[PDB]
Design a protein around this ligand. Structure first.
Ligand code: HEM
Length: 86
């Protein structure tokens, strides 16, 4: 409500290369550009889903509670409600 920044999925889709990498997880946008080289699962698997909603893959992997906490550092905004799916 207050100072929440909103992005359309169309904007997120443009950040799909190693130069500026964004990813959507549970309706929120994360800029993981600087996390690529630090990801224990490697950088390739992240680049393969860059610029898109990676929620299913993130959950399917079974990430730990510590992995979820790491997300906060990369949070940059929410996906506009009109772009969220049923
Ligand atoms: C951008 C948010 C993400 C964060 C912060 C993150 C963080 C992490 C962390 C901390 C681990 C180590 C877990 C452990 O100690 O067991 C890990 C492992 C892994 N991550 Fe991610 N991850 C993210 C997204 C993804 C995505 C989108 C995929 C793609 C399917 C992925 C695939 C993996 C895989 C395959 C492993 C290895 C697990 C194993 O050892 O079997 N991650 N991730």
């Amino acid at each position: 409500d207050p100072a929440v920044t909103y992005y359309r999925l169309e904007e997120v889709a443009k950040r799909n290369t190693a130069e500026e990498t964004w990813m959507v997880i549970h309706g929120r946008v994360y800029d993981i550009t600087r996390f690529l080289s630090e990801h224990p699962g490697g950088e390739e698997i992240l680049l393969e889903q860059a610029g898109a909603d990676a929620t299913e893959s993130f959950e399917d992997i079974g990430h730990s509670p510590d992995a979820r906490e790491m997300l906060k550092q990369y949070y940059i905004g929410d996906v506009h409600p009109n772009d969220l799916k049923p």
